[PDB]
Amino acid sequence: MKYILVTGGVISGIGKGIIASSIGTILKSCGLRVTAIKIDPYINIDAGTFSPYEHGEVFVLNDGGEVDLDLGNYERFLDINLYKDNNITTGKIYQHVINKERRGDYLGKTVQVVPHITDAVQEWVMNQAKVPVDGNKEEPQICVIELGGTIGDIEGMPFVEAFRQFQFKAKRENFCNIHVSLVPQLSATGEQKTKPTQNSVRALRGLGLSPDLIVCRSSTPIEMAVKEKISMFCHVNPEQVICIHDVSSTYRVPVLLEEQSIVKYFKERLHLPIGDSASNLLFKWRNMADRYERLQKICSIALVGKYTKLRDCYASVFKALEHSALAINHKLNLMYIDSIDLEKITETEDPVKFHEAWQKLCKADGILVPGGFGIRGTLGKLQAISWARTKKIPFLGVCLGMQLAVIEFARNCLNLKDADSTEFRPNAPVPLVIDMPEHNPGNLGGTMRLGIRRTVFKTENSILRKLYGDVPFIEERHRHRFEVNPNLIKQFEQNDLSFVGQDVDGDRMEIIELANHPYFVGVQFHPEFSSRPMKPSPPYLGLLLAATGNLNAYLQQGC
Amino acid sequence: MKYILVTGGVISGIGKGIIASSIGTILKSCGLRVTAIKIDPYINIDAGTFSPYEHGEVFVLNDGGEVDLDLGNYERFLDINLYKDNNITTGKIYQHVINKERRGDYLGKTVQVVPHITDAVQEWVMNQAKVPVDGNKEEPQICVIELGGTIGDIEGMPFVEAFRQFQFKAKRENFCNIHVSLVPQLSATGEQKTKPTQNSVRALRGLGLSPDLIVCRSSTPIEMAVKEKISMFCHVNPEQVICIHDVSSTYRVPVLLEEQSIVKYFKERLHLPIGDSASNLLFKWRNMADRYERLQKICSIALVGKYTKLRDCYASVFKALEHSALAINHKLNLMYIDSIDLEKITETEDPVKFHEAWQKLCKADGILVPGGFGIRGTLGKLQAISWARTKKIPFLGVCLGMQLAVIEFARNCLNLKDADSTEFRPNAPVPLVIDMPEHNPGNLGGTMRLGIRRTVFKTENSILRKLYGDVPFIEERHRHRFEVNPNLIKQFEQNDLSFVGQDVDGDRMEIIELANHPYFVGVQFHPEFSSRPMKPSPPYLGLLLAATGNLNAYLQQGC
Amino acid sequence: MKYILVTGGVISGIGKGIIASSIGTILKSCGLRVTAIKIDPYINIDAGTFSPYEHGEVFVLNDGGEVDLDLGNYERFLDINLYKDNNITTGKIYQHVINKERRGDYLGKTVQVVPHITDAVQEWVMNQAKVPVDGNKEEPQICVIELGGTIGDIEGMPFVEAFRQFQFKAKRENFCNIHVSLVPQLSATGEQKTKPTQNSVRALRGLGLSPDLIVCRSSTPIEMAVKEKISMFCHVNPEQVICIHDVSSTYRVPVLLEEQSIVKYFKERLHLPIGDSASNLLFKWRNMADRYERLQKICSIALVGKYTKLRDCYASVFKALEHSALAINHKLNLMYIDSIDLEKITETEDPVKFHEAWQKLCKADGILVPGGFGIRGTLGKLQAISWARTKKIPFLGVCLGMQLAVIEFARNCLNLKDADSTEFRPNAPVPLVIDMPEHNPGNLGGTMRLGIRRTVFKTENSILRKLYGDVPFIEERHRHRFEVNPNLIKQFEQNDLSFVGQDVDGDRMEIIELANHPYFVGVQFHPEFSSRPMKPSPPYLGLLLAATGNLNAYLQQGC
Ligand SMILES: Nc1ncnc2c1ncn2[C@@H]1O[C@H](COP(=O)(O)OP(=O)(O)OP(=O)(O)O)[C@@H](O)[C@H]1O
Ligand SMILES: Nc1ncnc2c1ncn2[C@@H]1O[C@H](COP(=O)(O)OP(=O)(O)OP(=O)(O)O)[C@@H](O)[C@H]1O
Ligand SMILES: Nc1ncnc2c1ncn2[C@@H]1O[C@H](COP(=O)(O)OP(=O)(O)OP(=O)(O)O)[C@@H](O)[C@H]1O
Ligand SMILES: O=c1ccn([C@@H]2O[C@H](COP(=O)(O)OP(=O)(O)OP(=O)(O)O)[C@@H](O)[C@H]2O)c(=O)[nH]1
Ligand SMILES: O=c1ccn([C@@H]2O[C@H](COP(=O)(O)OP(=O)(O)OP(=O)(O)O)[C@@H](O)[C@H]2O)c(=O)[nH]1
Ligand SMILES: O=c1ccn([C@@H]2O[C@H](COP(=O)(O)OP(=O)(O)OP(=O)(O)O)[C@@H](O)[C@H]2O)c(=O)[nH]1
């Protein structure tokens, strides 16, 4: 099978996944079945126990994933839905190997990093490329492999040697190599240097891998004097240096590689079956490049998270939002509001950060309350829903807001201020939200609810049901532990806030809507992990429709 | 002797010399005698045969230097004038060693890179620190050593091993180590990475040198989360991480190190004699920081060079100009004008680049024609002086303009269009500018005129004589081969353009002034290499005085 | 042209030249024209100023060589005589490059180690392979390139990068790579390790060269478990691991590579024109393997040198001696005798080292006095010739003995004890040996006599003339400064010791013979540098013939 191994340049946050997916999604437009394998040097297995401020938010797979992210980017760009066993971490390999030397399966031979780890790496990447990953039941023909991390450090040492042996066991027509480096320029002056790319190549070539292409991502487009120096010093012909500058939206990244002629390259390098057309599909990639230049009324949410500045804790939501903004031809203005900045305590001690949050939340044409944990933010977010409740600005609750909207509603309408979730204080006189993890055969003890779960819409008066297409059940994914008590439904069996969804059996509800409001939805499932640039997320699409008021206008068409 | 060895971070053009001079010129304000030794890994000996577009302009020393530059920066910041034997290049060492193994002075032993080169390096740096360099006849006490180049490449291999052996032969109280790295951030996003600094340390520590300080120069000032990661990963305490952002003028660079408390550091590290005052001299460094923020009428030259965009071919002039702009409280607006863009040929084929040059030269309140060679630019620059001649905008000719102004004047006034310099065409019917290199005892053949040369002012009616202080002779330096024929003076023994200067004997003139003009000077010597931020260059100071019209107002004071 | 680049393993003294010549001299038996280029990382140019105890004796070429040695080994094994410009040292390159940047031939561009040195290396190796080197006037087809030194150190850094760029500029069919490593075993125990070969490969592959073959030279022949580990860890198939153990004579080294089938390898790798016969010439390499096992009367010299233990100061003579011992079917017993151990002074202070020298010199069936310099040994060697003079044991004087034999003869027969050479004391009342270097046009001052020089035999009664084949002139090479005065011949115009040779003009004599003696020869030329395993050196061949007494028996055949 043809394999493409991208790597890393000087710094980690270049845009590794934006290149590996782009050369993947060009080849998906070529008519090739694609997989993706992300090699990760971080020891930690099963990323789900991260605080999301170090790396980013989780992604969630079908079979129970808690996989990093970058993995999410591949899923969103390629139409692929994945499995959890191609997030191949260093802790995944060692737990696969330390659990074999107690079995004795290496026949008493002492196992060392070479070859008995690097044999287990080049068996892992053979099997995950072999399994189909898309709607067809058929093995693919390429496999874009992302060696994450940087290169030269101690973490990346068992892996580049694992692929050095792999160039020999594979054929040279079956292997490729991309190197995505940085040419940093100092705005302080004006020249543009090529030295960081030279030392990053001789750390790659010094470990026994040679770049086919070399991709120099920087701030500005680079001059032909720079393409000459990288061609002469890094010992590759000038047809393999591909510039990519900092573009405004990531949809320019696939069509910018079309101009630099990488499509016909892998015809000659990899010897893959291709004939040439318009080198991507003209209707669905060059179109939405022009949608992002020519824009309109800057509108359509404020966001209440619980973090400081856009570390990608919420980058997996912002790519889902501008999917919907791609549909309604609006520029989107994502503005973070810290839930600390809505507390009583900040106004007492600092009004510069507090009054700064309200200013944006009162002018907000839409709120969004995504998921979170812990006591931070929760007491601040309790006022944000009720502000949206009375003054009727639409919002969506995701995995925490659905908990918090049912808390505030009994406090306001039913005057039951004593009620709260059992997340925080177990001494609950009215335990309105109870813990109940899935007690399944094959799952011992308390196991977090995870994976694809069917949930059926009960009754017709849902604005969500018309958005998915009036199908009875939807198929979504979530990672949360807590539910409103089905006994505690008795408290709200008459109001305007009634529960809509039910799963296969019916022991939880997962979905709320409110009558006397434009658009009041709160869901337990994360509706971000199926959002694609072609069809947006159906809760998020209506949420921007409610912000522009065209939500009734979308259902005038129907039909 | 206490030695400070700065190095290099990721890319070459960080600001190595701006840090090594700054920690030098803090210690000069401490009351310590300073030298400077710049280690250069480039094989080429005696930089003077450079095209000035690869590296920059030359510097010229007293004894006959053709030394790079960075060396010039030390000279200008420290009051030091240097010798040519501390520009210690790789070609200087090998020519010092290959000329010893024919002598047999290694006693028949085969010489290899270690130790017999690295012995010759640590004897070179011992001797150049030992020689006095300033007005006192006394050995200094520190020696700021600049290991130029970057680190990790093949050129820098004989030198870091040369200083690894040097930490043992010296005492730990006598040695220091600075590392000036880059933390590149991508404006494309917003985070700030620390990885390039980590790999640059483990290439330095992997060659056997440990940083005392670590200096992270970048675009923006960096947050305490970045100072924590560099302290924890690069294994130095957080008192040795010093931030320096891209500041507007280089005079902030000494006073910004004062805020980060590096003055008291070397009291504890190097054990040098110091008591504390205001940590620099309050009148002459923090004052001119405020001169550059608060500014005035944006005026005071256009420049006609012969190059494209400000590669530092003329950075050794621009630092001399804003010395004078530091004196007259004016912002300076250096605008390059290519001499190609004044030719007849560009207007025929492209008026976008041609008309763009004139636009700036007609609004120019002052022209400047610095030195150059070859047929490029010369035919273009012939119109620039005559444009300044008739319409009377002041300019200065430096080492080529003095040739070109005497050419145009016989063509215009004396109608001798046949005359030209013997630089370009030897078939000269009127050879107005003749070749005559110095034929000296000890100098065989044609040797370029070079070094400090006395030149005496003949007569009183010079506007230059009042600027230097009415001394009879001035002491300047130049590197040029050509002179107007002393026989050809007969052509101009009556006009308004008469020759002013004479050297010790009188076989050349070196200096012109024109009567019916505000300020018309052309000099063979380079008046850039003595310009300091305290007293500017005396031709360049009057040139900005003529631009603002206060040139008469400067001599109203006198006295 | 097909190029083979051998390298180095862990330690320097493996046997680099014994492998590179052997794969050369197999291909010479294949019917291919061969050159040789030895890359040397030692800075010193023109090895001739060595003390011969660091590296070894010199070799002397035709055009004036003072080249190391290993070069001598190629000459002796291949029938090739060389030029001095393929001893390409590091000091040869830099003196070729520092003498070009004063010319300006790099067009003002700053030259660095990459590429402008490595361009000059891959132009040097192109030209020396291009020039013919053998009796034909035709370019060869292979070029065995010896990258001397080891690999990984600082000296070998400009060269392995110089050949990494060379694999791309050449074609993969035109390039090869040998790696000659050590597998050290400890007699202390018994196992045999493969670790030093693994780390030596990943320092070679880490610099961008891959071994075609891998040659493991050690003490014992190695087991198939060792060939499996080197095949699996060093990532080459088990057909390219070639064992070679410590063999008794170096003539087994070509025929041992025949058994391991490297002849058919380069047919497949290099794509060179070959058909197969007996894979070497059966009459002249496998024959003299059996000559060295089956041997005879252990006889046939003691040697008086001036050194301690057989550092190869005299290895260029011992290979010439066992050429003659290959002809007379005798085992040779080379025993060193220090000339210190024949002095008066050692017997006074130590008789353990003194009496140990005489014991071997009185039982000596032949003496040999090779070349040397300085006051050490000279006063000791004066008794060794007179011991050979009276008691009539044959010897040969080489470049110093010819001086010393003419000194002792006037002291003994003519009773002129006052006479001595002008090498040591210039106050000579009878200056019997005078200095006269060649004063040639194109050679300024005192230049050492060097290169091929014709010398004609005057008269018939020479035992040397019958050995060369009664040709009038012979063609030999030497490096010496001193001659007997042609005026001082008047002292010996009647004795039994008369001068035999004369060059083209006749101002020196170069050759002595004595009548009343079996074999008394002393020559100024070095007769070691033409000795080949087929025909021995004609003075050295008769010297072993005089030791066995068959010297008359050789001339009974004639004819
Ligand atoms: N072409 C681009 N131009 C500007 N910004 C980009 C581009 N590609 C990606 N980015 C932004 O930079 C960040 C880094 O990109 P990406 O997540 O693909 O790298 P990654 O290798 O997956 O990260 P990690 O190494 O943490 O897994 C992303 O959050 C994205 O928003
Ligand atoms: N603190 C600073 N902020 C912004 N720009 C700077 C600073 N210091 C220096 N520069 C600019 O960047 C350039 C590089 O500085 P400098 O010449 O000191 O480096 P260098 O090591 O001497 O260069 P080279 O390695 O070529 O000798 C200079 O031309 C200068 O104008
Ligand atoms: N196959 C062999 N077995 C045993 N000894 C050998 C063998 N080949 C060479 N030697 C001996 O070991 C010494 C080293 O061999 P050789 O001179 O070929 O190495 P070299 O690389 O030329 O040395 P240098 O690196 O100093 O030039 C020689 O003096 C020779 O006598
Ligand atoms: O996609 C990736 C790739 C790599 N990594 C992991 O990040 C590490 C490299 O991390 P960085 O290079 O980003 O540096 P750092 O985390 O130490 O500090 P910052 O610069 O982020 O402020 C690697 O050790 C790798 O395990 C990720 O977390 N995500
Ligand atoms: O002050 C210095 C320092 C170093 N150098 C020399 O510059 C080389 C490093 O040069 P660079 O790191 O700047 O890269 P480059 O010249 O190959 O191409 P650009 O990035 O400039 O476009 C080093 O090999 C060193 O010899 C200088 O010229 N001046
Ligand atoms: O054939 C050669 C090869 C290499 N060399 C030169 O020898 C050096 C390697 O020398 P060694 O590896 O032999 O170590 P050393 O000389 O320092 O000390 P000993 O082990 O000999 O006792 C290299 O730096 C190279 O320049 C030779 O002299 N002759």
Curated annotation (Swiss-Prot), chains A, B, C:
Q: InterPro entries per the record?
A: Class_I_gatase-like, CTP_synthase, CTP_synthase_N, GATASE, GATase1_CTP_Synthase, P-loop_NTPase
Organism's domain of life? Eukaryota
Gene3D superfamilies referenced in this protein's UniProt entry, alphabetically: 3.40.50.880, P-loop containing nucleotide triphosphate hydrolases (3.40.50.300)
Q: Reaction catalysed by this chain?
A: UTP + L-glutamine + ATP + H2O = CTP + L-glutamate + ADP + phosphate + 2 H(+)
What EC number(s) would the UniProt record show? 6.3.4.2
Tell me yes or no: is ATP-binding among this UniProt entry's keywords.
yes
Q: Which residues form the Glutamine amidotransferase type-1 domain?
A: 300-554
Identify the catalytic residues: C399 (for gatase activity), H526 (for gatase activity), E528 (for gatase activity)
This protein's pathway reads: Pyrimidine metabolism; CTP biosynthesis via de novo pathway; CTP from UDP: step 2/2
Q: What's an example GO BP annotation here?
A: CTP biosynthetic process
Q: Which GO MF terms does the UniProt record name? A: ATP binding; CTP synthase activity; identical protein binding
Please report a single Pfam family linked to this protein.
Answer: GATase
Instruction: Please state what class of enzyme this protein is.
Output: ligase
GO cellular component terms listed in the entry, alphabetical order = cytoophidium; cytoplasm; cytosol; mitochondrion
> What are the alphabetically sorted keywords of the record?
ATP-binding, Glutamine amidotransferase, Ligase, Nucleotide-binding, Phosphoprotein, Pyrimidine biosynthesis
Function of the protein: Catalyzes the ATP-dependent amination of UTP to CTP with either L-glutamine or ammonia as the source of nitrogen. Constitutes the rate-limiting enzyme in the synthesis of cytosine nucleotides.
Which family is this sequence assigned to? Answer: Belongs to the CTP synthase family.
Q: What protein does this entry describe?
A: CTP synthase 2
Which species does this protein come from?
Homo sapiens
Q: Which gene underlies this protein?
A: CTPS2
